[PDB]
């Protein structure tokens, strides 16, 4: 119906390529071949009233947009594709774009997929704490504790039983502890506190980064520097702080050097792997920072304010529990930004 509109452009685009190709052809020809013959023609020609019109219209048109102009100032997708000729076969880039077109429309024809687990959706589509069931927790493997040979008997009250040489964590308690922990994250988020997500096991970064992003929080995936909280001025004083309003938008006010050296202590610490982060947990105690952590059957519950009994070895179980806590924080953040609007 409107294809001609594009066709009109393509016509010009083709013409432009032709003009450029033969501009380069004349760039090779020696001047001795063209210049003297060209000048001789003018010596044998007489300008007419009309010819003179362009003799000065082009002089100004070239003395305005080429010489007396500012060289600088004080179809959008894939705009660098070089289309191939209508007779030539598709280029490699065009075949890639031709496949992308198929992928959007045709590639998903025939059936839809239901009741299938996709790992990425645990991070990007976490459920709300009220909709979590024992089945959902069990599907994520949260019930699978450590070997009975590695039992830390202080977790006895969380154990549902032993099966296949491991302790089975009681998911009914996990759900109740998870809901309590989630409410704490939501409260701190809605109050404007700093939430730090700590996890140093391989693969946890993706979950940790998204959890921080959707709660406007912070994360550490590589290493907890011993002293980050107790020796904060020697470790974190150099890094930059900023002032923000109630909408979490940077105020842009420059900060006095006094305000940029003061310790910035987290209001809540979430630890995915507490058994390998004793340093951080002890610093949190010393610094009176409430903490949440996943407590496996070999982990000491009393070292954290709000324990969540659950498997800490599986990325699915960890990311499932982290996702729930992250969405709870998001709802708190959304409720704080909403009360500011109204």
């Amino acid at each position: 119906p409107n294809n001609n509109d594009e066709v009109m452009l393509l016509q010009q685009k083709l013409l432009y390529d032709e003009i450029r190709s033969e501009l380069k052809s004349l760039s090779q020809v020696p001047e001795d071949e063209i210049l003297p013959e060209l000048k001789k023609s003018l010596e044998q020609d007489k300008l007419s009233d009309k010819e003179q019109q362009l003799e000065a219209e082009l002089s100004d048109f070239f003395r305005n947009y080429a010489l007396l102009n500012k060289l600088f100032d004080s179809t959008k997708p894939y705009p660098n594709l070089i289309p191939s000729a209508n007779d030539k076969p598709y280029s490699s880039q065009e075949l890639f774009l031709r496949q992308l077109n198929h992928s959007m429309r045709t590639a998903k024809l025939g059936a839809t997929i239901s009741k299938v687990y996709y790992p990425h959706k645990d991070i990007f589509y976490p459920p709300l704490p009220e909709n979590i069931t024992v089945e959902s927790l069990m599907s994520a493997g949260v019930h699978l504790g450590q070997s009975t040979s590695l039992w830390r008997s202080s977790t006895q009250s969380y154990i549902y039983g032993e099966y296949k040489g491991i302790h089975i964590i009681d998911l009914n308690q996990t759900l109740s502890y998870l809901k309590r922990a989630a409410k704490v994250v939501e409260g701190v988020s809605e109050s404007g506190g700093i939430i730090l997500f700590l996890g140093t096991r391989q693969g946890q970064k993706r979950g940790l980064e998204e959890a921080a992003k959707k709660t406007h929080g912070y994360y550490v995936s590589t290493r907890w520097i011993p002293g980050t909280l107790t020796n904060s001025t020697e470790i974190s004083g150099i890094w930059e702080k900023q002032e923000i309003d109630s909408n979490d938008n940077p105020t842009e006010r420059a900060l006095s050097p006094n305000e940029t050296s003061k310790q910035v202590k987290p209001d809540l610490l979430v630890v995915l792997n507490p058994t390998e982060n004793r340093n951080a947990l002890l610093e949190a105690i010393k610094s009176r920072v409430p903490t949440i952590a996943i407590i496996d059957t070999d982990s000491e519950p009393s070292l954290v304010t709000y324990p969540i009994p659950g498997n800490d070895d599986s990325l699915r179980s960890v990311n499932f529990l982290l996702g729930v806590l992250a969405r709870a924080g998001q709802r708190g953040l959304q409720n704080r930004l909403a009360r500011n609007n109204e």
Binding site: K13, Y16, Q53, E57, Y65, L71, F72, D73
Partner: protein
Amino acid sequence: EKGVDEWLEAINELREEFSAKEYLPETSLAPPGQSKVDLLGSKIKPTAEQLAQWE
């Protein structure tokens, strides 16, 4: 003189198009169906005899 007539029609239409917006070489003089040029070759092409010797 159609030659001077069509040339003088092409020069004034261009003036209006450039006048519509601030004239910047990269943007105002973009290729047809293109966002903008970069105002940035001397890679001489080997002659047929030069290429034959290399082969």
